[PDB]
Amino acid sequence: EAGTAFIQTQQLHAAMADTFLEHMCRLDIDSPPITARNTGIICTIGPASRSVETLKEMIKSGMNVARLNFSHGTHEYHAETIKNVRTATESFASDPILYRPVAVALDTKGPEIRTGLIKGSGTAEVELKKGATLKITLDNAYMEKCDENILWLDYKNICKVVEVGSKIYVDDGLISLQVKQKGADFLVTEVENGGSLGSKKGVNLPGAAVDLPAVSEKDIQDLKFGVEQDVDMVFASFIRKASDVHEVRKVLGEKGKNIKIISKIENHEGVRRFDEILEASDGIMVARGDLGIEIPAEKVFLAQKMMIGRCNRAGKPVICATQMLESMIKKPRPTRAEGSDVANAVLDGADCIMLSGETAKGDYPLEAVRMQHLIAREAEAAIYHLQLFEELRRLAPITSDPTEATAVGAVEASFKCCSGAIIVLTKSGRYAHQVARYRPRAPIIAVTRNPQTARQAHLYRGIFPVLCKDPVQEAWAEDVDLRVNFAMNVGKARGFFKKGDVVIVLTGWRPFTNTMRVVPVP
Amino acid sequence: QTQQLHAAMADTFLEHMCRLDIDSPPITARNTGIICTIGPASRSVETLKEMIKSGMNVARLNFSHGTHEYHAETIKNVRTATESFASDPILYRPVAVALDTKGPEIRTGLIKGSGTAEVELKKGATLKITLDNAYMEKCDENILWLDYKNICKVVEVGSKIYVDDGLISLQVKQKGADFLVTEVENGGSLGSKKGVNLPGAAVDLPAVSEKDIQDLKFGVEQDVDMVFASFIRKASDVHEVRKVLGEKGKNIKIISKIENHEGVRRFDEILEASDGIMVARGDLGIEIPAEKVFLAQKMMIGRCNRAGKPVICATQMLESMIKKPRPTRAEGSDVANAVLDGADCIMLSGETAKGDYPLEAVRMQHLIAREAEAAIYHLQLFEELRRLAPITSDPTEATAVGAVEASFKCCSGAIIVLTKSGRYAHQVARYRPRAPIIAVTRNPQTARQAHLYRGIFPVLCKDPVQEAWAEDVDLRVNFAMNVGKARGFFKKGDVVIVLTGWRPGSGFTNTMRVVPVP
Ligand SMILES: O=C([O-])C(=O)[O-]
Ligand SMILES: O=C([O-])C(=O)[O-]
Ligand SMILES: [K+]
Ligand SMILES: [K+]
């Protein structure tokens, strides 16, 4: 019983526009999105979020990957966080239809520069005033005696790499110092941007050639611990060149060879050497916190769109990270810039978006996860797939690989029939990755028996991993039918599609491979 | 290369993105207008001079607060600062004055002054909402007065009420003659005179209140350049504003602020009646779900671009810079994407009115906008603007498009256009050239109003009119040439596009010259 104007869901009116300009003009706040949310959500776990009961709610709210930030915390602290993540995750395991795999990511400390402790207890702060003099010292006598006159930091070669006139940034680049005088193991600086300085804050030296290793001896100890803890992926801080990626990957040994290596790009050299880093990496993080201090803040969006574009072109995962919902550390709703930032990261093409302080330390971790979920789903509907899919095809080589032809044919078919899902049977993830790179509108239900595959799948836009727990059937066709039926039940239970809807099914490895069928949901 | 020219030549949007280069420096010129709200942080003549130097094009006065005496002095200070640069007519920048109306705002009263200046509203606590003016200056955690006297008629039991940027939320539990009983849903600290939103209600406040009439008439008397009309819901609201401005104010530009669901739904009729649009995201993101604001923003920017009318992106673009000298990564991204979307202007509110770093916020909008302007994919944008434009044989329109295509062909340093009232320059700006549009006018109001359009760099010519029409045209063109050289837009060996009128007594701007600099 209509009346006047029935509004198409999923921005389908905008989807049909013949120009991008008209696509924008048709975006409709009254066009509700589909249930499925394709962009992966990565959450940094910390004091605000590491209890088992909070982690259960994080998972329910949409967290796909638990990020452990090894810039802070000792190994027993991280071991307990991982234990809690797994307790919370497996509390849902009794129902495989509804169980969500949750990945664990180790984010390295890497070649950070950090200050010491403010004198006293270390929890106080000192007010640095503009124009005042501040001495930076390497003398360890002051490593717990920092104040408004003398500042200790832990980079022993700093005096070599800076010069008179260079700028030094402290605490998220909020405090700035100008080097007036150099010394043996000290620098005399003048405070440019003042502010309140706490303990153990991050330091950046833009334009200085910092010579700390991408992977220090202590970083190796963290990586080995990560292998022992069976982490799914490493987010490697401050990657500057391809050989840095190899230092991360090779040291994990044979035991860690399946761990995904995500290079964090957060300095000027990583941007300049991006292509060789991307080639050596499994994926990329646009690590905007350090990046926006190392290069001018006004250039970060160029680097972000460049990297997301190149990762989309290569079919490798890319994460947009840092300060996406920053005000939600203290407030229950985001600023308008933060809502825009999350949406535009998805429209840019990010496979995943990330929360750091918002979930690690803030007062509203659940609300932050929920808001990334809501924004991502709205933005996914607004993507101009008509142009995106055409360009991804044109920028993708014609190869003789039959599996790539299957994947592009499946995504083409999914657009042609507006399918409710692409179901993919996958052991390693590869077949599902191949579909995701063409960025279908429809969700990808990736059925696997491999738990690590299920967890690592979250790196890719649109791959909804489901972990089949049933034994392998001796008859291959019976085993395929079992796994397809599992995916059909998942999609119906989660509201992705209904009986009678059309879906695409890719049946995976056969003892040709990955047959495609376009079927009504049984 | 420079100016993201390598990315500009990509054959796909995806490759365009892949080619964006942080080491490709932009041109000197910055095309996106910057609107700054003036308040205690920015009201002094000394600070305003630095704001102008830093890039402020439009001073916004917020009539939600203050007296007419206060705003008259703000306007006086803006003009003193602006005219302190007039001794150099080649470098002088016109600065516009914008009056932002209170409109059908709902606000709480003053917190009872004998206790803590803020009160703590705790989740689950009861809070009584009263309309009894006895409590207008006695608000606390027990009783909260607000100024919407008819609120009980438009809410029912179960309605939700949002306070202070929608950070505090209440749920109505009972009603009464002139009061409501609510329970705190999302608690927090409550200060004085905070904005209130009723997203589920049909608020029946007048589009133009008696106070708004007084303020708009004051704006006419003060010779403001534009009005930002709050909470515009429909075309008839725009008509009311235009009626108040009347004949004396007929040339004042009306920018309708879209900040509720109805304004979005009725956007096309509002746009038709308005001179331009503000995406007023503060209220909009409380009236509708926060996760839908980007859809409304890109819809309005797109349709304003399609219509050739100015659109402003506003509110919380650099919000953390109220307290910090550098923005968050989301804020830098937001400013860049507003420019990439197509916004003519970007705006600062608390960042310049009240914050500790007003000049840094202005400078950051300048820096980001200029970087984003180079990153626009002009190849697709210009093709789509041309394809969607109305069909016409008008010589001036054809000359404008020809000029923009010529400017791309030779990567020109500027398009110079002569205009009395603005339109000839507006017609070029709507095709969104990369090159700056140096618009020469003798009309000071046109020079100030031109800031509403992407890429129109107004220059106010103060020379007497020459006896010969052709000599007067040449004088104004030569003035633009010297401004562009002095500002670093171009130098000898560069090429500039020059648009001028047909002949004496014609209104056609139908003559295009491609001029080596020179
Ligand atoms: O390390 C990070 O995630 C960053 O700097 O954004
Ligand atoms: O009024 C405004 O500017 C807003 O609400 O964003
Ligand atoms: K780290
Ligand atoms: K106002």
Ligand SMILES: [Mg+2]
């Ligand atoms: Mg970092």
Ligand SMILES: [Mg+2]
């Ligand atoms: Mg408002």
